Amino acid sequence: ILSKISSFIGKTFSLWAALFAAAAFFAPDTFKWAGPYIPWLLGIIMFGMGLTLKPSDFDILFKHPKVVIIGVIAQFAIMPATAWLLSKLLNLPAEIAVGVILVGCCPGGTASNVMTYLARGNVALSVAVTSVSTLISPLLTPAIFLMLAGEMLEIQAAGMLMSIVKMVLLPIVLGLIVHKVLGSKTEKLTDALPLVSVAAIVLIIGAVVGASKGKIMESGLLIFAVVVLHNGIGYLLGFFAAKWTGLPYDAQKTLTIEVGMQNSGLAAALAAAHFAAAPVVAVPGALFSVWHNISGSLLATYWAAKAGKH
Numbered sequence: 001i002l003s004k005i006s007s008f009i010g011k012t013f014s015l016w017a018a019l020f021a022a023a024a025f026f027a028p029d030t031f032k033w034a035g036p037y038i039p040w041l042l043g044i045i046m047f048g049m050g051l052t053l054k055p056s057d058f059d060i061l062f063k064h065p066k067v068v069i070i071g072v073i074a075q076f077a078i079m080p081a082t083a084w085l086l087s088k089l090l091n092l093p094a095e096i097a098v099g100v101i102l103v104g105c106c107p108g109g110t111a112s113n114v115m116t117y118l119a120r121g122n123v124a125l126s127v128a129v130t131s132v133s134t135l136i137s138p139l140l141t142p143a144i145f146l147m148l149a150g151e152m153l154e155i156q157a158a159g160m161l162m163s164i165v166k167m168v169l170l171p172i173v174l175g176l177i178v179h180k181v182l183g184s185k186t187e188k189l190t191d192a193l194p195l196v197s198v199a200a201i202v203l204i205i206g207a208v209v210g211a212s213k214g215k216i217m218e219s220g221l222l223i224f225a226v227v228v229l230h231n232g233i234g235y236l237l238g239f240f241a242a243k244w245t246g247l248p249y250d251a252q253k254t255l256t257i258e259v260g261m262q263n264s265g266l267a268a269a270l271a272a273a274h275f276a277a278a279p280v281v282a283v284p285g286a287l288f289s290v291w292h293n294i295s296g297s298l299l300a301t302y303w304a305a306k307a308g309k310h
């Protein structure tokens, strides 16, 4: 029972998130109790990621490091640069540009693992690239964010590294330990992971939307269009990054999805933690978490149909 509702909730995530977002846009007091808990809500999500990691998920890293490295490089070369170029070309306000760049600087999101499966790409590659990007993000996300956004607002890069360590790295390590400890019984914790992760992230979105209602009223449509462009250009450059390195079609699909899909929950949590007096900074991350599941689903559905799915 717990499993099949998890799949339905997974397929309908953007609808649930959109309704919670609407509820927060008309009743901000609704989810403002969750604001202070955003880092912990993300911590739970990343704790779930650690519970599902296994040593065989890194077999491809030691057998085929170059393809994995290509994916990780494409992640941190395309999405931060794309966020900066969009911010400059569209002349976005500093607050919004910082939040868009912040999203672009985060690692990939584990949802890319599922979209890659649905798209019939290389799932082992998707899992490896997301895992590696995530584990090195405490160093790379602040470093790139500092370089691209440091002239817009004051950035405490070392402080953000420690935030990622506490919200990402330690929960993952706790998840790895708990799993090595529990062994096979861990399946009974991960049976709850999809619904818990969905509840946590919609709470983050609702808290972010409520705190920035006024800014969404004046800039909500602009931010949405930037997210669509940022996510979409990611797919495009990820695809051709794979094609021009000579990788096969299944890997092209994987890195398309890997690059365009982001750990946008982390971007929202970092903005809440470090830019709390500017709530709109977290809005790009919140919207990205919704849109990239819609866009990734459309892309995966398209590629599955091309691969012969009835």
Ligand SMILES: CCCCCCCC/C=C/CCCCCCCC(=O)OC[C@@H](O)CO
Pocket: 035, 036, 037, 038, 039, 040, 042, 043, 044, 047, 163, 166, 167, 171, 196, 272, 273
């Ligand atoms: C369902 C399984 C339950 C297992 C629980 C494991 C979760 C462990 C996660 C820990 C992550 C905590 C790191 C969170 C610590 C950083 C929070 C912070 O300092 O920012 C200030 C905020 O209050 C601003 O809003």
Ligand code: NA
Pocket: 108, 109, 110, 111, 112, 113, 125, 126, 127, 128, 129, 130, 131, 258
């Ligand atoms: Na992935």
Ligand code: NA
Pocket: 075, 079, 107, 108, 109, 257, 258, 259, 260, 261, 262, 263
């Ligand atoms: Na990505």
Ligand code: NI
Pocket: 310
């Ligand atoms: Ni048929």
